[PDB]
């Protein structure tokens, strides 16, 4: 399901500020990370990343192919491919606390400047 900047900023309200990250920086990150596509699934190298946040099954969720993953978030990666973001957000919250915003590699190169443009100009 391809969302949009504003939908993303609306469903993500609850993660705002956590670990110093704003919703400007998140829309920027998510756009380059998933294209805002809740069903995004990208194979990297022996691991797969899931959903809007591209959470990896290598350490963060249990996937049918990686039944030994520490599954730090304690969730089935597939639950990160639906349109309910609550659990994707909660897991993201764990990634921030444990590894920090640099899990999301788009952060430093694309989201270090010009954030004004990423705000949702709608109520």
């Amino acid at each position: 399901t391809e969302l949009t900047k504003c939908k993303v900023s609306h469903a993500i309200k609850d993660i705002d500020g956590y670990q110093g990250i704003s919703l400007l920086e998140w829309a920027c990150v998510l756009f380059h990370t998933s294209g805002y596509d809740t069903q995004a699934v990208v194979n990297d190298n022996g691991s797969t990343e899931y959903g809007l946040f591209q959470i990896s099954d290598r350490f963060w969720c249990k996937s049918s192919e990686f039944p030994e993953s520490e599954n730090i978030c304690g969730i089935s990666c597939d639950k990160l491919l639906d349109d309910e973001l609550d659990d994707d957000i909660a897991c993201a919250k764990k990634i921030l606390a444990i590894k920090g915003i640099d899990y999301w590699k788009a952060y430093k190169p694309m989201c270090s400047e010009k954030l004004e443009q990423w705000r949702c100009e709608k109520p």
């Binding site: 990297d44 010009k114 990423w118």
Partner: protein, 272 residues
């Protein structure tokens, strides 16, 4: 013998761009008698100062090309450009390398005519207003500025993908484009970086005359998201010196000259 006017009197403005009715090249060819063998057109009235080579990176996207041709040919003529169409076809099965095929287009088009301007366009983007001129400006030109895909808005101010234009000098100054981006994403962010590090900014038509339609498709095989794009994009400053025009290598397997366009097949190697 007269220089063409700054703005063309043939411009029609917004146009309806749909992809239902299947296209017939032969008919398209017929509707476009002024286009010569290989997709070359030159105004007979005035003298355009815009010698433009439109470069299209390509691989199993023939349906798209048909539409591209049907729409752009009439448009580029109305814009009174001295142009040539170049479809750079990637041979083989390794990951798609958009930026390297564009580099090749640049080298290969220069062999035919001394073009001064270079437009790099994906096959699936059609401009919806002929005021969105396919030429070069005082600064590097981003053309597909408001695509239907992103709700007719620019996704981010640093975006330089889709359709863009650089003069020969502007292109040469950044050592052309990178050859090291295999798979989807980031090569355009790199190019953008290159311009900045060379003191150039990006010119753009406004969101209304830059409305662009993109022929819908499924994410192509052999062009998956490059897992390294983000790391590569952060060293443009240094890698742009060793990766670009000055390190381009490839082999021309076949130059095809059709009536509406020139298609070159090349072997650009593999992700080394």
């Amino acid at each position: 013998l007269t220089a063409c006017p700054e703005e063309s009197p043939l411009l029609v403005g917004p146009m309806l761009i749909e992809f239902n009715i299947p296209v017939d090249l032969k008919l398209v060819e017929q509707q476009n008698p002024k286009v010569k063998l290989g997709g070359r057109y030159t105004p007979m009235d005035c003298i355009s100062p815009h010698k433009v080579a439109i470069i299209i990176p390509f691989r199993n996207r023939q349906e798209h090309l048909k539409y591209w041709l049907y729409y752009l040919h009439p448009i580029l003529q109305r814009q009174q450009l001295d142009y040539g169409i170049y479809v750079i076809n990637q041979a083989g099965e390794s990951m798609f390398n958009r930026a390297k095929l564009l580099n090749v287009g640049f080298k290969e088009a220069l062999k035919d005519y001394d073009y001064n301007c270079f437009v790099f366009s994906d096959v699936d983007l059609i401009p919806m207003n002929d005021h969105n001129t396919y030429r070069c400006f005082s600064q590097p030109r981003h053309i597909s500025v408001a695509m239907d895909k992103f709700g007719f808005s620019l996704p981010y101010v640093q975006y330089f993908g889709g359709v863009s234009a650089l003069s020969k000098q502007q292109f040469l100054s950044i050592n052309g484009f990178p050859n090291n981006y295999w798979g989807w994403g980031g090569e355009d962010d790199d190019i953008y970086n290159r311009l900045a590090f060379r003191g150039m900014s990006v010119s753009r038509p406004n969101a209304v005359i830059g409305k662009c339609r993109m022929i819908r498709h499924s994410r192509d095989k052999k062009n998956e998201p490059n897992p390294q794009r983000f790391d590569r994009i952060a060293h443009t400053k240094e890698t742009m010196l060793s990766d670009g025009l000055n390190s381009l290598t490839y082999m021309v397997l076949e130059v095809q000259r059709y009536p509406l366009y020139t298609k070159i097949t090349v072997d650009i190697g593999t992700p080394s």
